[PDB]
Design a protein around this nucleic acid. Structure first.
Ligand SMILES: [Ca+2]
Ligand SMILES: [Ca+2]
Length: 341
DNA sequence: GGTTGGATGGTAG
DNA sequence: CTACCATCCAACC
């Protein structure tokens, strides 16, 4: 009946500002340095000082630095970030046990058991915001509404250190006036594909045939946006189990030579097993990105869990199969584990 | 309809 | 960039 969603503001860039106060009120850019050349890699997150001028997540470093020399570029630290994140989800757990952790910086709380209306929800939302800022020193945004999507949207509306309630009549005006672009779970690839055809707002999805929408953007997205445009979305705050853990690393030059790829592949296995942590996958996949960024996978499922040395030995054979089947040089190599027990 | 195989495609931090 | 998931096109119990 009532959902409370929490989103950590510019999370990666914020931990850095808290750990290292020499940085605040300044542009701060968290990067992934691929490993190849100088500036090799992409922006992973950026504070709002860096974002006003187009330095945002996804873009390359050599484009961020030409759009802003100036700023503070920082190697990513997912361990450090994950530490803080685990602690914050633990606080949130005490306000309600029904919690959907959707990612390192997002969570959904169903509070239809703890409050009576939205007014009691807003009070609780400020309270959670205040405890987090006191214990961790992190500003967060809270969205409140009737289903998950509208709680997230409300947070998207309030973003930098904000709180927002989207009640019932506001939900209805949003269906007619909200762009498809601003819908959680709908990226710029889908938005602009629909944009071409005049599908601009959420209500427009109810003006088009289902197979026409399906044949354009696929199954889930078609039913998803249709539910929402009618107001028939209210799926439960379900727990999230990771389906797969894998690592990919970039070589310093393209190679079709078995013995030269091996060191990188083995370095992926080590870090991947690190991440599994007491989990035991029944299945494994090797991923190679070739010369012209083309993706090739071979994997294998087992009637038992895979030991660390079995992976070494099996991953070598899956890399062989790729090399006999594809005559192109490989540029990045990695492994994926799934079908846990 | 279920498992398992492999392919680009998409969303997000 | 990296991480993780989805979509689809396939064989076959
Ligand atoms: Ca987020
Ligand atoms: Ca299928």
């Amino acid at each position: 009946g009532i959902v409370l969603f929490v989103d950590f503001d510019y999370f990666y860039a914020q931990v850095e500002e808290v750990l290292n106060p020499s940085l605040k009120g300044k542009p701060v850019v968290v990067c992934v340095f691929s490993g190849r050349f100088e500036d090799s890699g992409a922006v992973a997150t950026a504070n709002y000082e860096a974002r006003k001028f187009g330095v945002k997540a996804g873009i390359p470093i050599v484009e961020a630095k030409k759009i802003l020399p100036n700023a503070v570029y920082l190697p990513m630290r997912k361990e450090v970030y994950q530490q803080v994140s685990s602690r914050i989800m633990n606080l949130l757990r005490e306000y309600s046990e029904k919690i959907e952790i959707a990612s390192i910086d997002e969570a959904y709380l169903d509070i239809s058991d703890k409050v009576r209306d939205y007014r009691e929800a807003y009070n609780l939302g400020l309270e959670i915001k205040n405890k987090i800022l006191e214990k961790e020193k992190i500003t967060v945004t809270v969205g409140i509404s009737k289903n998950k999507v509208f709680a997230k949207i409300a947070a998207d509306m309030a973003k930098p250190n904000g709180i927002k309630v989207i009640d019932d009549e506001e939900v209805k005006r949003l269906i007619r006036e909200l762009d498809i672009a601003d819908v959680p779970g709908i990226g710029n690839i889908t938005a602009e594909k629909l944009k071409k055809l005049g599908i601009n707002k959420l209500v427009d999805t109810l003006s088009i045939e289902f197979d026409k929408l399906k044949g354009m953007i696929g199954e889930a997205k078609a039913k998803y946006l249709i539910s929402l445009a009618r107001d028939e979305y209210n799926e439960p705050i379900r727990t999230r189990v990771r389906k797969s853990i894998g690592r990919i690393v970039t070589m310093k030059r393209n190679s079709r030579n078995l013995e030269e790829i091996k060191p990188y592949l083995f370095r992926a296995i080590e870090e991947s097993y690190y991440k599994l942590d007491k989990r035991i996958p029944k299945a494994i996949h090797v991923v190679a990105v070739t010369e012209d960024l083309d993706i090739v996978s071979r994997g294998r499922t087992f009637p038992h869990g895979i030991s660390k040395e079995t992976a070494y030995s099996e991953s070598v054979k899956l890399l062989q199969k790729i090399l006999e089947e594809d005559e192109r040089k490989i540029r990045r190599i990695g492994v994926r584990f799934s079908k846990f027990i």
